[PDB]
């Protein structure tokens, strides 16, 4: 009866930095994934463990929409079994990921003359992230032998680092808004379905 509010996610006014990705869960509604493919000309629209053409035929208990901003160079890392600072320290998808990665270039919104440095990504972590983990900690990273808890030595870094989005940047350095729809399927009944 009710159509799933995809406009709230893809058409949001503000977007989160990748280290603090936003999540909105979708249920008790109906989703046409073909209407959303052509909803806007998307940079990337790929899926894993499922295929885009069949998307309306499936049915899921819950659907989670995760949104954030990264470089175009780093859309490759938003995929199962990928390595890199974004996948290791900011947003990790599991090896058995079933869902879709949708991204588009957002230079017109997120870049700015003189540079936009408001978006951040985690630069250091003592571990690689576990799937769908979200670390927004701000605590001084200690790299090397000498400790830094109060010592404040050289080899101790503030964990988050700002992106530098210039409008004249190459396409790889330009900001991309990314939406990842994870298709959770459980033993409980389904709540979201194609027509």
């Amino acid at each position, epitope marked *: 009866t009710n159509l799933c509010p995809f406009g709230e996610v893809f058409n949001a006014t503000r977007f989160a930095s990748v280290y603090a990705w936003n999540r909105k869960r979708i249920s008790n509604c109906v989703a046409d994934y073909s209407v959303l493919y052509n909803s806007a000309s998307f940079s990337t629209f790929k899926c894993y463990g499922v295929s885009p053409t069949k998307l309306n035929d499936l049915c899921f208990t819950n659907v989670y929409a995760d949104s954030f901003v990264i470089r175009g160079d780093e859309v490759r890392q938003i995929a199962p079994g990928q390595t890199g600072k974004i996948a290791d320290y900011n947003y990790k998808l599991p090896d058995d990921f079933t869902g879709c990665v949708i991204a588009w270039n957002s230079n017109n919104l997120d870049s700015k003359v003189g*540079g936009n440095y408001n978006y951040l990504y985690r630069l250091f972590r003592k571990s690689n992230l576990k799937p769908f983990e979200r670390d927004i900690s701000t605590e001084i990273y200690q790299a090397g032998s*000498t400790p830094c808890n109060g010592v404040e030595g*050289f080899n101790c870094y503030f964990p988050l680092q700002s992106y530098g989005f210039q409008p004249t940047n190459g396409v790889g350095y330009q900001p991309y808004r990314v939406v990842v729809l994870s298709f959770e399927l459980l033993h409980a009944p389904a709540t979201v379905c194609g027509p």
Partner: nanobody
Framework: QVQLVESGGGLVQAGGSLRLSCAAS????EVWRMEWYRQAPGKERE????????????RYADSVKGRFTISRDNAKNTVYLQMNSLKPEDTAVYYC???????????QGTQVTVSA
């Protein structure tokens, strides 16, 4: 258009004062961490001081803690390093670097000699 330029330095004696300035072009210096490095001729490069992005703190090596102080002038887009109570081992060439982590595309030094 991106570059860093070191100024200041020279000859001073044990107990003397000095201030080095690193003038950056092509980016605001407060958005990323800025660092000061030094390399004595025999030894390897050593990190001496660093000031994190925005107001997230300062970092000083044990070698120079309490004697050196790093600071940032957002108007002059310049990071300064004030060197007080200089000891003969502080002789080196002094370099500044941006911890841009590849968000830039840029990738000379100044000499400081302190006698006994």
């Amino acid at each position: 258009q991106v570059q860093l330029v070191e100024s200041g330095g020279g000859l001073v004696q044990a107990g003397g004062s000095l201030r080095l300035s690193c003038a950056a072009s092509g980016f605001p210096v407060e958005v990323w961490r800025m660092e000061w490095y030094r390399q004595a001729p025999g030894k390897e490069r050593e990190g001496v001081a660093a000031i994190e992005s925005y107001g997230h703190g300062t970092r000083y090596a044990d070698s120079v803690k309490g004697r050196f102080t790093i600071s940032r002038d957002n108007a002059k887009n310049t990071v300064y390093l004030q060197m007080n109570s200089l000891k003969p081992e502080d002789t080196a060439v002094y370099y500044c670097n941006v911890y841009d982590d590849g968000q830039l595309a840029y990738h000379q030094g100044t000499q400081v000699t302190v006698s006994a």
